[PDB]
Enzyme design. Structure first.
Site, PDB file in Angstrom:
ATOM      1  N   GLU A  64       1.192  -1.301   0.164  1.00  0.00           N
ATOM      2  CA  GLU A  64       0.482  -0.188  -0.160  1.00  0.00           C
ATOM      3  C   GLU A  64       1.170   1.157  -0.055  1.00  0.00           C
ATOM      4  O   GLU A  64       1.792   1.754   1.282  1.00  0.00           O
ATOM      5  CB  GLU A  64      -1.053  -0.197   1.123  1.00  0.00           C
ATOM      6  CG  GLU A  64      -1.330  -1.288   1.250  1.00  0.00           C
ATOM      7  CD  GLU A  64      -2.736  -1.766  -0.052  1.00  0.00           C
ATOM      8  OE1 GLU A  64      -3.072  -1.146  -0.078  1.00  0.00           O
ATOM      9  OE2 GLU A  64      -2.939  -3.378   0.370  1.00  0.00           O
ATOM     10  N   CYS A 111      -1.849  10.068   2.746  1.00  0.00           N
ATOM     11  CA  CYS A 111      -1.447   9.989   1.417  1.00  0.00           C
ATOM     12  C   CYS A 111      -2.708   9.393   0.362  1.00  0.00           C
ATOM     13  O   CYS A 111      -2.502   9.328  -0.655  1.00  0.00           O
ATOM     14  CB  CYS A 111      -1.253   7.836   1.907  1.00  0.00           C
ATOM     15  SG  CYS A 111      -2.536   7.025   2.731  1.00  0.00           S
TER      16      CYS A 111
END
Ligand SMILES: NC(=O)c1ccc[n+]([C@@H]2O[C@H](COP(=O)([O-])OP(=O)(O)OC[C@H]3O[C@@H](n4cnc5c(N)ncnc54)[C@H](O)[C@@H]3O)[C@@H](O)[C@H]2O)c1
Ligand SMILES: NC(=O)c1ccc[n+]([C@@H]2O[C@H](COP(=O)([O-])OP(=O)(O)OC[C@H]3O[C@@H](n4cnc5c(N)ncnc54)[C@H](O)[C@@H]3O)[C@@H](O)[C@H]2O)c1
EC number: 1.2.1.71
Lengths: 487, 488
Positions: A245, A279
């Site tokens: 991720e 993010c």
């Protein structure tokens, strides 16, 4: 709050070299501890492997009961954990508490996800009575970032533990304290010995864990750089399931908006929330070239200057806090310094608010014709690009090998429709900030933002593998035999 | 009716590579002649599939479903001719090749339901607004096809990929190129747009040029754990290219406490010898409890196993199993059981070459109870038997393999099965039914050296589409309660 390691239910000083977690603004030491050494890691893995045999055998109900108890403990200590996060990262309290409530919410949704993506199903089919159940992998090493040292690692830990996995958690060397606290909360929740195992440390520790020949899975939340490093390391080892991720150079489109201050709101959310350290933040804002965009950017800069930034616990809560370290801020300042001398002009100057801290002021920079690197970065530095036709805007959005988030702020649904049609990105929003994803739906980046193991809801997919069975009840001959079979 | 051409962007064209031919495993005669695709041939296939993707991904789901269903219509329409091609080119008897065709046909509606469940379109109201989830295709997916099922397995990758909006550059086995060319012609006659599927014949060189090609967006593989690991190692560091690996296994079958002898002997022969033991879910190792009961069982098993017929795919009375893919492969199998016997094992039933230079092998059973053979996958009618004391010792043996595809037990006692399911680490695990005959309606993914956790069959839909989740609003406007530090 001791600085220890945790293995097989026992707290023990690490055998590695000591390190400390410093608060990003005060500079004083917030955490001191010993990093896990090689044999320390071998211990964590060996004991999670041992605990697996007994933990995988617990029913789904029992595992859910322990995890839920963990949730009750989360509610009971919401404020102390929030204060730990905000203290150690620089994130304001009001946002840390958001991360906590997110940790709590990750539980019931992980449950429903387990039951749908990897449940127990039974059916009558041609080849007999078919049954499907889902099995855990084993020992999964979970790496945690520093922006969300609670929400993200938890988002790996809950789905994995629930499905019968055992965990060797290695948090960032910039947020070890929050990690230790979370581990203590799993202990105080009654989690069997060795079912979770804490290994503090930095680069060396993570190296020893990742290369360790006895892990059965690795779940990663972090930079696309190190993520690709890991993926290359496992090259030739399909047996170990890997979930990556990673970041993204997320673009946000704002064209033809009738509510100015609204689009300025959602924009500021997307680019500057968490000091631009989420993010899913928009690192590139796209505005139609000319008069309309001039009006918008005017208001956006006006309001963005009005943003407050202070210590995580300022008497009046600021919008965003410090960056993780003063050094990171230094590299950001040098970053926009490299942008300006590259040909871009500063719409809003990124400023260091206090002498040697990570307190950065919002920064907006126009490099419409300039060509900078396709690179991810945390911080309140937003690159803006002006575009002619909308069909050019779509060209720009996809102008990056990353593919995490992207969205458009517009009154015209068809701009969104054609965006969804064309854009290659993980989450793509319309009229809502890029931040604030929904754990109830997947969260998986494409391109350099993942290896096609989407987390959040589809987390349940990479925590359990499927076992399918054709049951009969009695081994006995068919009505019509096959050719060449004589009895 | 065939040609031997490559097929790219809707056009049939001789390959620029060196010529090869597909030989019948028993007849020896030439069954196929053609030129393998060269480097630039593959670059063309990939470039044109990429071009066609842009147009194919925008078609609705319903329309693509309609084309594929047309493909099903053509499969039913030519069932016998395709069966004859399979049996001819592989040696598989007709009666089961017809089964492979019916399996290709069935792979469609289930692929549909799978697409709509695992990667459908859903909408819900949640805290952050009106959330929506849809699933997007990856792009150009290179599909590699085995030789044991040159029709079913490649199809099991292709339907799910096409349906989800992907385009395919299919590279079949250099042992079954004819089946590939015919199947492609069936996709053409089905109305598949130009470049949505592209056939690239060839052998090792061709497949290398395809896998290494810097423009594929995915690779779907069915083949040996060996080459599969080679590929996985190749993509080391390229997470952007989605890879799905479907590989072999050292599948164990346990038979303890069966009250119906001939039944358990049936299921055993099914699992170990069907298709000349060339089904990836075959049991390569049979586990029988030490002593009287196992003695009687294995006795019957050898008796009936000797009664197996093996002949050409088109034998006047259809045999149970046909030839193995090639005579040379058979040679390596004979060398295999020879190495086992000289390794310390005893021959319960000798594997014999039925005709001089063919792939006709007779069933072979070998007891290596005390010997330690390699943990290795292999196709052929060679069954190794292992005898065990306690049931927990049988379970000890089952996991005595790095592969993890299939496993099952033949028993009247459900709790032996329960303890198996609890302990065994394998993809599909059957109880009282043959290891063969999987269910396309449920996932199909081996663990360990049998896959990288992208199981196909039902879960194929997972690696054919990636998820896009969105928080829709309708109007960008301020919230009721602002965040602290925001002035207007
Ligand atoms: N995809 C997401 O949801 C997501 C979430 C958070 C951050 N990010 C991205 O990550 C960037 C910042 O990186 P970060 O600090 O969050 O993650 P990171 O790169 O620090 O990785 C996490 C931890 O892994 C360990 N580590 C370091 N080197 C290692 C190595 N060589 N081998 C094994 N382990 C090693 C350390 O504990 C490290 O802090 C963000 O700015 C953004 O680009 C993405
Ligand atoms: N996982 C399954 O469902 C499954 C199915 C069938 C067979 N198997 C197992 O696989 C083996 C039989 O398969 P096989 O021999 O057809 O596999 P294989 O290695 O021949 O792979 C198929 C084809 O890929 C091409 N190829 C060869 N080398 C390549 C390379 N280096 N790079 C790219 N392409 C290359 C060739 O066309 C080759 O014939 C046995 O172990 C069998 O039990 C597993």
């Amino acid at each position: 709050l001791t600085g220890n390691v945790y293995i097989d239910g026992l707290w023990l000083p690490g055998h590695g070299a000591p390190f400390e977690s410093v608060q990003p603004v005060t500079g004083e030491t917030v955490w001191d501890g010993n990093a896990a050494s090689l044999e320390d890691v071998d211990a964590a893995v060996r004991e999670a492997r041992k605990a697996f045999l007994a933990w995988r055998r617990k029913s789904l109900a029992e595992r859910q009961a322990v995890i839920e108890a963990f949730g009750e403990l989360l509610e009971a200590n919401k404020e102390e954990l929030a204060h730990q996060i905000g203290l150690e990262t620089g994130k304001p309290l009001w946002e840390s508490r958001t991360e906590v409530a997110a940790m709590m919410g990750k539980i019931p949704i992980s449950v429903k996800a387990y039951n749908e993506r990897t449940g127990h199903t039974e059916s009558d089919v041609a080849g007999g009575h078919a049954v499907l159940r889902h099995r855990p992998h084993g020992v999964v090493a979970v790496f945690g970032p520093y922006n969300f040292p609670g929400h993200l690692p938890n988002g790996h830990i809950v789905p994995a533990l629930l499905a019968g996995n055992t965990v060797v958690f290695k948090p960032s060397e910039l947020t070890p304290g929050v990690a230790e606290l979370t581990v203590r909360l799993w202990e105080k929740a009654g989690l069997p010995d060795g079912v979770i195992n804490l290994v503090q440390g930095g680069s060396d520790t993570g190296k020893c864990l990742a290369r360790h020949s006895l892990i059965d899975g690795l779940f990663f939340t972090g930079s696309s750089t190190v993520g690709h490093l890991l993926h290359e390391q496992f090259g030739g080892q399909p047996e170990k399931i890997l979930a990556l991720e990673m970041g993204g150079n997320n673009p946000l489109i704002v064209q033809n908006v009738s509510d100015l201050d609204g689009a300025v709101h959602h924009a500021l959310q997307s680019a500057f929330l968490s000091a631009g350290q989420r993010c899913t933040c928009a690192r590139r804002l796209l505005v139609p070239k000319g008069k309309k965009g001039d009006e918008f950017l005017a208001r956006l800069v006006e309001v963005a200057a009005r943003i407050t930034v202070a210590e995580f616990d300022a008497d009046p809560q600021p919008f965003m806090g410090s960056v993780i370290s003063a050094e990171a801020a230094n590299q950001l300042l040098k970053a926009q310094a490299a942008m300006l001398e590259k040909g871009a002009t500063s719409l809003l100057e990124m400023k260091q608010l206090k002498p040697d801290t990570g307190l950065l002021s919002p920064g907006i920079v126009d490099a419409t014709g300039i060509e900078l690197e396709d690179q991810e970065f945390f911080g309140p530095l937003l690159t803006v690009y002006r575009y002619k036709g909308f069909d050019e805007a779509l060209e720009l959005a996809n102008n990056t090998r990353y593919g995490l988030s992207a969205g458009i702020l517009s009154d015209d649904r068809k701009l969104y429709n054609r965006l969804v049609e064309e854009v290659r990105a993980g989450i793509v929003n319309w009229n809502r900030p890029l931040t604030g994803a929904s754990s109830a739906a997947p969260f998986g980046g494409v391109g350099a933002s993942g290896n096609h193991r989407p987390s959040a809801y589809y987390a349940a997919d990479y925590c359990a593998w499927p076992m399918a069975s054709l049951e009969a009840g009695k081994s006995e001959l068919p009505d019509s035999l096959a050719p060449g079979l004589n009895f």
